[PDB]
Amino acid sequence: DIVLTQSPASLAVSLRRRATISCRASESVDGYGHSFMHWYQQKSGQPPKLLIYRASNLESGVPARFSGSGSRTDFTLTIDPVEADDAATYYCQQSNEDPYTFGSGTKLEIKRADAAPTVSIFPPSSEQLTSGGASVVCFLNNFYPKDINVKWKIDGSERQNGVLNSWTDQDSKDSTYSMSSTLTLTKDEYERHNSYTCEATHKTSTSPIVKSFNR
Amino acid sequence: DIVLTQSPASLAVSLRRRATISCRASESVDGYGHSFMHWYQQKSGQPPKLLIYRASNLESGVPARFSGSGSRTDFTLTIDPVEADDAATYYCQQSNEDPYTFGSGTKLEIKRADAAPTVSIFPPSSEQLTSGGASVVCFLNNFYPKDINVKWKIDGSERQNGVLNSWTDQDSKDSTYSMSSTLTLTKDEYERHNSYTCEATHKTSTSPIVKSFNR
Amino acid sequence: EVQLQESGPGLVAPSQSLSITCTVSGFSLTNYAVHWVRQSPGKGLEWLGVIWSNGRTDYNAAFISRLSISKDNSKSQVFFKMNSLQADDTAIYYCARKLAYEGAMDYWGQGTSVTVSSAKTTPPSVYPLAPGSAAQTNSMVTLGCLVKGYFPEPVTVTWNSGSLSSGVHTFPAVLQSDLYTLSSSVTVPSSTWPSETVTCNVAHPASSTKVDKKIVPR
Amino acid sequence: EVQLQESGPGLVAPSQSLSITCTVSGFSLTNYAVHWVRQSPGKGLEWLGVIWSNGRTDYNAAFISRLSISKDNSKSQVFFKMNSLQADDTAIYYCARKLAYEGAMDYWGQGTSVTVSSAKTTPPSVYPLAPGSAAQTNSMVTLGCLVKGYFPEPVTVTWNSGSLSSGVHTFPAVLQSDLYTLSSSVTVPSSTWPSETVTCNVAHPASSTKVDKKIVPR
Amino acid sequence: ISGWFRSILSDKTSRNLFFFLCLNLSFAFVELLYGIWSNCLGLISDSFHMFFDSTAILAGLAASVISKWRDNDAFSYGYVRAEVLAGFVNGLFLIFTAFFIFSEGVERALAPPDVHHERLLLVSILGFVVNLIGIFVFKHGGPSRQILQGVFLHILADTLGSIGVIASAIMMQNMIADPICSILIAILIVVSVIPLLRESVGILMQRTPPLLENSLPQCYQRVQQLQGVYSLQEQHFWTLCSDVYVGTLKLIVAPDADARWILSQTHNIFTQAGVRQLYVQIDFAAM
Amino acid sequence: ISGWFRSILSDKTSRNLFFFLCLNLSFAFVELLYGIWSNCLGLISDSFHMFFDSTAILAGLAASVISKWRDNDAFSYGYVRAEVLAGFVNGLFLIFTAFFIFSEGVERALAPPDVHHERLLLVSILGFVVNLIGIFVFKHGGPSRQILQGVFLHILADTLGSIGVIASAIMMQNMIADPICSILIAILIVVSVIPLLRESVGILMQRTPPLLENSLPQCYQRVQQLQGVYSLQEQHFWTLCSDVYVGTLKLIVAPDADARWILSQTHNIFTQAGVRQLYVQIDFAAM
């Protein structure tokens, strides 16, 4: 079997700089001067899209900014000039030996100017209260970079038992990120306490953004 | 050289009936069981679009209603079920012998319910009068079938010297036709007479539609 | 206009079989080969098998004892069947036609998420999310819906039947107590809301549940 | 996203040469062949020549003494040159890439109309057309523009920069006294007109003339 | 076992070869019986030479019979080249028989004969009658062409030897005649056998078919004119039987060249030239 | 003209063949000079037989020299099969020399010799020395394998004839011995030459290479397992030289099968089996 290794595992490039993805095969995938290496692009929640076939041929309809090279074992995918729509995961496939194998994806992150998260907080609805539970949801939208911390205070007390966090993949329009922080509590626990605060500690500002509701 | 003959030259089919276009080659275009005959579709004012290649294979992305068959010399293009968007000209090409040749097109007419022309008449504008000429334009829009006659009366007198007619190809939305009748006259000739009438004699109604302006 | 549509069970018991039908359009199976590829978080993209024009099938060496791929040229359907499903076989199964005269797969279909577990399908519970206080009227207000307690993973959240596409941030689901929790966010100008109605459409294909929720301010 | 764009002179003298540049996008000339096909009313579609990946050219038997097809892989441009143009060489010259591993031309470019005559280019004269009498208020009124006295044949008429696509009937040109006459018609609801402005955009690429005409009721 | 005899009798050429083989072996046996009493020095040698030419005819017959067999996954082209091998063997047999006649003539010219003479001439006339009958039977003008030509040339050589001995006998009655006649017979045999050996060696050396050789440049030019064919390389045409040619070709075409059309056109072009079996390998060039 | 001599002297095998050819021709000429005086009946025959074996050695030498020539658009594969033709010719020469020895032994057994005997044995010892020297020189264990084996078997046959005549001379001093020894020598020569003729005929009959024949089913199975290959048909493998195999193949693949990958894999598969030159024709099946 042929084991394909892609380096680097995660790549960060600016909006218009040069991007290079390398995929190395365990053994040669060449025959009669043809290199049977194929490159795919998979965005967030979409099937992979073929970019390069036989490691040097552009698929019909793809932008000309993509390039391929290499032979035998070492192969290179070149994206120049990069755009905000190129934030996706790229795979290399070899068709030289059965079975076909796909290398580990190379995540591409588009660097941009730092942005402040749009912190918003939502108290549990009436249906939540009547259902016997309570969920406090804090939304962080359009912030860069991905690294961010959320602080939950309950009536001035710190709690971390029921905090769940979910991140989105980098957006293809503005190259930003979104995050949700959900605090799940029982009806009595929610009713006992009054003030709930959500904080978003981010690199852009040393002062965390505080959104609170008193109920 | 290979001479491709398409029959019939003009084909009229209903909106959902069966349509068949036949193209016959002067000599065989077969080799090792492959028939090198290709079918194209050319709408009004557009480049030809490939439908069938090698006389039996559907081009990627074309509707499944198109079919191809035949071998050696006789070939058949089948459109079923027909739609209003299939009103175009179809050509057959052979790639078996240099040079490639295209047969004479087979015009396809989509039959539908008869419609009354929307007759309108427009007097020459002020710019026309200041330029030293005069042009009376009569528009006939959305009428079926294509056969129609235009009668021009000038103050109750018949004139046919300066009448020019231009027809449009069948529309791809409602399978109708449009016609323009232009009467070109000099400034003094236009100013001498007062009443101008445009008539559209069509099969739908025995009484021609009369639009007139008195200037 | 080339599409490949997969139709298969989202939830499969850890000892039963799997059956996925790949309906193709825009091309004929008489001259194209359809591959079967699955993608899982822990093992990446894996090539399962391929069926050719005449019916010949090639299977992966590790799945040859379980796969069974059939065809129906007249109906333009490709059948994928796998036996002895286990907990490690959960993935996104794609059917993709082979690139003509190459080993690549140019056109892929949006495959059906398959999970292999003993849990039972649970309809989603959709809840509205509205701002607590009528403040921060900066002309961009945030609205959301909380899809909590549903199984399996796949669920679709759209706003106003997808007309309000801009500003929608659907967040990935999180697994807690063998149940999934998903959240969505939409930002709409304050001029339109609450003057214009806002609808939360949640669809769960596994449970055949469609819930339309309207955001009511407090 | 595959396009082929032709750029060539619309009017050619009956004793000079012709040069058409076919700029391709979405594919590389290093592995595709671009055909050259012309279409004329009296002779139908004719195959002129083809240039291959390595630069090899094949010409029609009747045009081998006049054609000259070149390539520029870096610039993705294909050059078509023909000598000794005559009155029978007027046609619509298309450049179309060859279908991979077949003799057909799957993707065609909207070719440039070429006329071969000794006449001189004349800018179009656009004139508004408005209803004479303020009657027939059935909520669908007809408007038009008269493009009279222009040469050569190709001319583009659009309404409101193409926004008002529905109801537009552009009529084929008629040749009179070695000059072309073209008419267009648009039907617009009577509520919008004359309340909303209506613009007639006429473009003549040969003479580089763009005329914007506004319909004034009487 | 009995199927061989039925098969030999079924075919006309095989039946004629069996008839002549039996006749030659029986007459050689008769000469051996007549010479066992005395005059061994010449009659025994002549009888063994007849048995040796009988072995050559038997080899031709065996090749003719084997040429009708089918493939067995070992002889992929079949046993069809048995006729060419038989022709080559008959050519070598004729050359070596001519050398043997040379040696016998020299020995007779350098040794006075005290053996019986009337018996030697009488059996030689019988051998001449046999050779004339063989010429008459095999007069012509699974493929079987080389075998007939080889056996016909062998019978012609035997007839030349018989007329040589008869002419020497006539001239001696009416010493220099015998060696000159022997040398002339040997030279005539070699010159007659030269074309057969030329053709057999040409077939067996994987040479381009001589008839096809003239039209090969035209076929290469016509294949080169095909659309998308960059070059034509590694062309090998050789001969299997009479009017059976096998050719191998390698084409280098464009990356998107029509492989089916090019293959069909190449096959048609080389079939119009007489190449019944052809293999064309189409390589898609990189840029 | 002079380039031939330089080329022959340049090659080791050609130089050895030229040395032995010159030695054999010179010793045959010496025997002819010694026998021109008298005892023609045996010495002239022996000298002509030596000149005839000299012709066989000359044929082998000519094939060895011609085997190094280049292609000329007529011999597309070249003159490389000259070695196989030389091996076949040497096999036929050995068979016919064995038959000649048979005839000479029978003649000696059926005729009392009144010719000189001491001279015959002395020159026979010289011929035995020549044959032993030839065996010693050509001891081994453009391709040139068949020629060496053929000439080695020829020298072995000559040595067998020499030991036969020497043993007959020894036993006569101390009538039945001569014919029995001659028959034994002829049988040994034929049995020794059988494998060489078997190999030469196998090569010349377009037979599947015997070494490759075992691995062909495995290669066909591995080619069949390639993706998109519907079937494999019209496979022909034949032998050109020693360890030089030429094969022709026809594959039927899917309408959209990867022709490049299938071609490369087939070439690799049949190259790992030892097929140096291969032609694969890929046919795209209709449905």
mmCIF file with all atom_site columns, C-alpha atoms in Angstrom, chain A residues 79-191:
data_model
loop_
_atom_site.group_PDB
_atom_site.id
_atom_site.type_symbol
_atom_site.label_atom_id
_atom_site.label_alt_id
_atom_site.label_comp_id
_atom_site.label_asym_id
_atom_site.label_entity_id
_atom_site.label_seq_id
_atom_site.pdbx_PDB_ins_code
_atom_site.Cartn_x
_atom_site.Cartn_y
_atom_site.Cartn_z
_atom_site.occupancy
_atom_site.B_iso_or_equiv
_atom_site.pdbx_formal_charge
_atom_site.auth_seq_id
_atom_site.auth_comp_id
_atom_site.auth_asym_id
_atom_site.auth_atom_id
_atom_site.pdbx_PDB_model_num
ATOM 1   C CA . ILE A 1 79  ? -1.945  28.557 -4.916 1.00 0.00 ? 79  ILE A CA 1
ATOM 2   C CA . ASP A 1 80  ? -1.022  31.997 -6.261 1.00 0.00 ? 80  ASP A CA 1
ATOM 3   C CA . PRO A 1 81  ? -2.461  34.509 -5.900 1.00 0.00 ? 81  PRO A CA 1
ATOM 4   C CA . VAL A 1 82  ? -4.426  33.320 -2.863 1.00 0.00 ? 82  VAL A CA 1
ATOM 5   C CA . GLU A 1 83  ? -7.978  34.570 -2.316 1.00 0.00 ? 83  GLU A CA 1
ATOM 6   C CA . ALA A 1 84  ? -10.435 34.503 0.574  1.00 0.00 ? 84  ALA A CA 1
ATOM 7   C CA . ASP A 1 85  ? -12.338 31.661 -1.133 1.00 0.00 ? 85  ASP A CA 1
ATOM 8   C CA . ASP A 1 86  ? -9.328  29.306 -0.955 1.00 0.00 ? 86  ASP A CA 1
ATOM 9   C CA . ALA A 1 87  ? -9.762  28.575 2.768  1.00 0.00 ? 87  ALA A CA 1
ATOM 10  C CA . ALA A 1 88  ? -10.386 24.826 2.554  1.00 0.00 ? 88  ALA A CA 1
ATOM 11  C CA . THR A 1 89  ? -8.804  21.408 3.095  1.00 0.00 ? 89  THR A CA 1
ATOM 12  C CA . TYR A 1 90  ? -6.645  19.939 0.326  1.00 0.00 ? 90  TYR A CA 1
ATOM 13  C CA . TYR A 1 91  ? -6.049  16.219 -0.235 1.00 0.00 ? 91  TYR A CA 1
ATOM 14  C CA . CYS A 1 92  ? -3.703  14.304 -2.530 1.00 0.00 ? 92  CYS A CA 1
ATOM 15  C CA . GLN A 1 93  ? -4.777  11.029 -4.144 1.00 0.00 ? 93  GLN A CA 1
ATOM 16  C CA . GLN A 1 94  ? -2.681  8.470  -6.012 1.00 0.00 ? 94  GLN A CA 1
ATOM 17  C CA . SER A 1 95  ? -4.226  6.240  -8.679 1.00 0.00 ? 95  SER A CA 1
ATOM 18  C CA . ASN A 1 96  ? -1.012  4.371  -9.512 1.00 0.00 ? 96  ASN A CA 1
ATOM 19  C CA . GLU A 1 97  ? -1.593  1.371  -7.220 1.00 0.00 ? 97  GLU A CA 1
ATOM 20  C CA . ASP A 1 98  ? -4.779  -0.279 -6.015 1.00 0.00 ? 98  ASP A CA 1
ATOM 21  C CA . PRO A 1 99  ? -6.366  0.688  -3.673 1.00 0.00 ? 99  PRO A CA 1
ATOM 22  C CA . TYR A 1 100 ? -6.594  4.445  -4.195 1.00 0.00 ? 100 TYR A CA 1
ATOM 23  C CA . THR A 1 101 ? -5.403  6.315  -1.111 1.00 0.00 ? 101 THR A CA 1
ATOM 24  C CA . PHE A 1 102 ? -5.941  9.865  0.132  1.00 0.00 ? 102 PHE A CA 1
ATOM 25  C CA . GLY A 1 103 ? -3.360  11.725 2.168  1.00 0.00 ? 103 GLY A CA 1
ATOM 26  C CA . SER A 1 104 ? -4.170  13.559 5.368  1.00 0.00 ? 104 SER A CA 1
ATOM 27  C CA . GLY A 1 105 ? -5.681  16.940 4.620  1.00 0.00 ? 105 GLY A CA 1
ATOM 28  C CA . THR A 1 106 ? -3.762  20.212 4.735  1.00 0.00 ? 106 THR A CA 1
ATOM 29  C CA . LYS A 1 107 ? -5.935  22.872 6.351  1.00 0.00 ? 107 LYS A CA 1
ATOM 30  C CA . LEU A 1 108 ? -5.398  26.324 4.834  1.00 0.00 ? 108 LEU A CA 1
ATOM 31  C CA . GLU A 1 109 ? -5.988  29.403 6.996  1.00 0.00 ? 109 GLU A CA 1
ATOM 32  C CA . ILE A 1 110 ? -6.236  32.849 5.402  1.00 0.00 ? 110 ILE A CA 1
ATOM 33  C CA . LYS A 1 111 ? -4.584  35.516 7.539  1.00 0.00 ? 111 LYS A CA 1
ATOM 34  C CA . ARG A 1 112 ? -6.189  38.948 7.778  1.00 0.00 ? 112 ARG A CA 1
ATOM 35  C CA . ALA A 1 113 ? -6.525  41.954 10.057 1.00 0.00 ? 113 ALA A CA 1
ATOM 36  C CA . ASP A 1 114 ? -7.634  41.165 13.596 1.00 0.00 ? 114 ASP A CA 1
ATOM 37  C CA . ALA A 1 115 ? -11.295 41.763 14.426 1.00 0.00 ? 115 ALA A CA 1
ATOM 38  C CA . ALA A 1 116 ? -13.320 42.147 17.624 1.00 0.00 ? 116 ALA A CA 1
ATOM 39  C CA . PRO A 1 117 ? -15.945 39.471 18.352 1.00 0.00 ? 117 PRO A CA 1
ATOM 40  C CA . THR A 1 118 ? -19.575 40.609 18.262 1.00 0.00 ? 118 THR A CA 1
ATOM 41  C CA . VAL A 1 119 ? -20.541 39.199 21.648 1.00 0.00 ? 119 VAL A CA 1
ATOM 42  C CA . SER A 1 120 ? -24.241 38.526 22.208 1.00 0.00 ? 120 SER A CA 1
ATOM 43  C CA . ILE A 1 121 ? -26.059 36.626 24.952 1.00 0.00 ? 121 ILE A CA 1
ATOM 44  C CA . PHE A 1 122 ? -29.518 35.047 24.913 1.00 0.00 ? 122 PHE A CA 1
ATOM 45  C CA . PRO A 1 123 ? -31.507 33.941 27.985 1.00 0.00 ? 123 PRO A CA 1
ATOM 46  C CA . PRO A 1 124 ? -33.397 30.632 27.828 1.00 0.00 ? 124 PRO A CA 1
ATOM 47  C CA . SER A 1 125 ? -36.814 30.890 26.216 1.00 0.00 ? 125 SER A CA 1
ATOM 48  C CA . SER A 1 126 ? -40.196 30.164 27.775 1.00 0.00 ? 126 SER A CA 1
ATOM 49  C CA . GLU A 1 127 ? -40.307 26.765 26.058 1.00 0.00 ? 127 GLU A CA 1
ATOM 50  C CA . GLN A 1 128 ? -36.981 25.884 27.690 1.00 0.00 ? 128 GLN A CA 1
ATOM 51  C CA . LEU A 1 129 ? -38.323 26.793 31.135 1.00 0.00 ? 129 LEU A CA 1
ATOM 52  C CA . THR A 1 130 ? -41.556 24.849 30.615 1.00 0.00 ? 130 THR A CA 1
ATOM 53  C CA . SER A 1 131 ? -39.582 21.837 29.346 1.00 0.00 ? 131 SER A CA 1
ATOM 54  C CA . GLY A 1 132 ? -37.746 21.504 32.676 1.00 0.00 ? 132 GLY A CA 1
ATOM 55  C CA . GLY A 1 133 ? -34.320 22.789 31.614 1.00 0.00 ? 133 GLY A CA 1
ATOM 56  C CA . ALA A 1 134 ? -32.407 25.966 30.878 1.00 0.00 ? 134 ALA A CA 1
ATOM 57  C CA . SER A 1 135 ? -29.727 26.815 28.321 1.00 0.00 ? 135 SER A CA 1
ATOM 58  C CA . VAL A 1 136 ? -27.831 30.111 28.152 1.00 0.00 ? 136 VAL A CA 1
ATOM 59  C CA . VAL A 1 137 ? -26.262 30.644 24.724 1.00 0.00 ? 137 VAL A CA 1
ATOM 60  C CA . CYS A 1 138 ? -23.503 33.177 24.041 1.00 0.00 ? 138 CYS A CA 1
ATOM 61  C CA . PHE A 1 139 ? -22.622 33.963 20.420 1.00 0.00 ? 139 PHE A CA 1
ATOM 62  C CA . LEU A 1 140 ? -19.234 35.233 19.237 1.00 0.00 ? 140 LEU A CA 1
ATOM 63  C CA . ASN A 1 141 ? -19.323 36.218 15.569 1.00 0.00 ? 141 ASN A CA 1
ATOM 64  C CA . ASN A 1 142 ? -16.732 37.504 13.087 1.00 0.00 ? 142 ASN A CA 1
ATOM 65  C CA . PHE A 1 143 ? -13.536 37.404 15.141 1.00 0.00 ? 143 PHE A CA 1
ATOM 66  C CA . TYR A 1 144 ? -9.958  36.660 14.087 1.00 0.00 ? 144 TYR A CA 1
ATOM 67  C CA . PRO A 1 145 ? -7.850  34.717 14.917 1.00 0.00 ? 145 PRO A CA 1
ATOM 68  C CA . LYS A 1 146 ? -9.422  31.431 16.003 1.00 0.00 ? 146 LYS A CA 1
ATOM 69  C CA . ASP A 1 147 ? -7.907  31.501 19.503 1.00 0.00 ? 147 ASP A CA 1
ATOM 70  C CA . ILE A 1 148 ? -10.375 32.907 22.041 1.00 0.00 ? 148 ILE A CA 1
ATOM 71  C CA . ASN A 1 149 ? -11.509 32.167 25.598 1.00 0.00 ? 149 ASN A CA 1
ATOM 72  C CA . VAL A 1 150 ? -14.993 32.454 27.116 1.00 0.00 ? 150 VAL A CA 1
ATOM 73  C CA . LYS A 1 151 ? -15.514 33.242 30.805 1.00 0.00 ? 151 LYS A CA 1
ATOM 74  C CA . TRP A 1 152 ? -18.823 32.437 32.512 1.00 0.00 ? 152 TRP A CA 1
ATOM 75  C CA . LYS A 1 153 ? -19.748 34.160 35.775 1.00 0.00 ? 153 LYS A CA 1
ATOM 76  C CA . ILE A 1 154 ? -22.918 33.249 37.673 1.00 0.00 ? 154 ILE A CA 1
ATOM 77  C CA . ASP A 1 155 ? -23.825 35.939 40.230 1.00 0.00 ? 155 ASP A CA 1
ATOM 78  C CA . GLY A 1 156 ? -20.131 36.754 40.508 1.00 0.00 ? 156 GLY A CA 1
ATOM 79  C CA . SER A 1 157 ? -19.162 33.079 40.862 1.00 0.00 ? 157 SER A CA 1
ATOM 80  C CA . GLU A 1 158 ? -17.115 31.083 38.356 1.00 0.00 ? 158 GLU A CA 1
ATOM 81  C CA . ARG A 1 159 ? -18.570 27.880 36.903 1.00 0.00 ? 159 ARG A CA 1
ATOM 82  C CA . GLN A 1 160 ? -17.184 25.575 34.216 1.00 0.00 ? 160 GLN A CA 1
ATOM 83  C CA . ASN A 1 161 ? -19.120 22.302 34.615 1.00 0.00 ? 161 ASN A CA 1
ATOM 84  C CA . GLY A 1 162 ? -21.770 22.852 31.947 1.00 0.00 ? 162 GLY A CA 1
ATOM 85  C CA . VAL A 1 163 ? -19.882 25.000 29.433 1.00 0.00 ? 163 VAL A CA 1
ATOM 86  C CA . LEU A 1 164 ? -19.725 23.634 25.878 1.00 0.00 ? 164 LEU A CA 1
ATOM 87  C CA . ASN A 1 165 ? -17.937 25.368 23.005 1.00 0.00 ? 165 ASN A CA 1
ATOM 88  C CA . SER A 1 166 ? -18.363 24.950 19.248 1.00 0.00 ? 166 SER A CA 1
ATOM 89  C CA . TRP A 1 167 ? -16.229 26.642 16.589 1.00 0.00 ? 167 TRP A CA 1
ATOM 90  C CA . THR A 1 168 ? -17.044 27.158 12.923 1.00 0.00 ? 168 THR A CA 1
ATOM 91  C CA . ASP A 1 169 ? -14.653 26.768 10.031 1.00 0.00 ? 169 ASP A CA 1
ATOM 92  C CA . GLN A 1 170 ? -13.145 29.925 8.574  1.00 0.00 ? 170 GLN A CA 1
ATOM 93  C CA . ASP A 1 171 ? -15.660 31.836 6.478  1.00 0.00 ? 171 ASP A CA 1
ATOM 94  C CA . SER A 1 172 ? -15.091 32.078 2.727  1.00 0.00 ? 172 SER A CA 1
ATOM 95  C CA . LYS A 1 173 ? -16.261 35.720 2.514  1.00 0.00 ? 173 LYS A CA 1
ATOM 96  C CA . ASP A 1 174 ? -14.377 37.656 5.215  1.00 0.00 ? 174 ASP A CA 1
ATOM 97  C CA . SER A 1 175 ? -12.028 34.909 6.510  1.00 0.00 ? 175 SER A CA 1
ATOM 98  C CA . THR A 1 176 ? -13.392 35.237 10.057 1.00 0.00 ? 176 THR A CA 1
ATOM 99  C CA . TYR A 1 177 ? -14.527 32.776 12.725 1.00 0.00 ? 177 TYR A CA 1
ATOM 100 C CA . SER A 1 178 ? -17.627 32.237 14.844 1.00 0.00 ? 178 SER A CA 1
ATOM 101 C CA . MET A 1 179 ? -18.033 30.590 18.241 1.00 0.00 ? 179 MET A CA 1
ATOM 102 C CA . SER A 1 180 ? -20.921 29.509 20.470 1.00 0.00 ? 180 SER A CA 1
ATOM 103 C CA . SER A 1 181 ? -20.734 28.985 24.235 1.00 0.00 ? 181 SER A CA 1
ATOM 104 C CA . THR A 1 182 ? -23.689 27.120 25.744 1.00 0.00 ? 182 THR A CA 1
ATOM 105 C CA . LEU A 1 183 ? -24.359 26.873 29.488 1.00 0.00 ? 183 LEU A CA 1
ATOM 106 C CA . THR A 1 184 ? -26.875 24.137 30.325 1.00 0.00 ? 184 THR A CA 1
ATOM 107 C CA . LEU A 1 185 ? -28.624 24.329 33.698 1.00 0.00 ? 185 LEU A CA 1
ATOM 108 C CA . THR A 1 186 ? -31.710 22.910 35.367 1.00 0.00 ? 186 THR A CA 1
ATOM 109 C CA . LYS A 1 187 ? -34.863 24.941 35.969 1.00 0.00 ? 187 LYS A CA 1
ATOM 110 C CA . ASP A 1 188 ? -34.294 25.387 39.709 1.00 0.00 ? 188 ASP A CA 1
ATOM 111 C CA . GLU A 1 189 ? -30.596 26.188 39.251 1.00 0.00 ? 189 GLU A CA 1
ATOM 112 C CA . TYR A 1 190 ? -31.424 28.872 36.681 1.00 0.00 ? 190 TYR A CA 1
ATOM 113 C CA . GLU A 1 191 ? -34.231 30.322 38.811 1.00 0.00 ? 191 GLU A CA 1
#
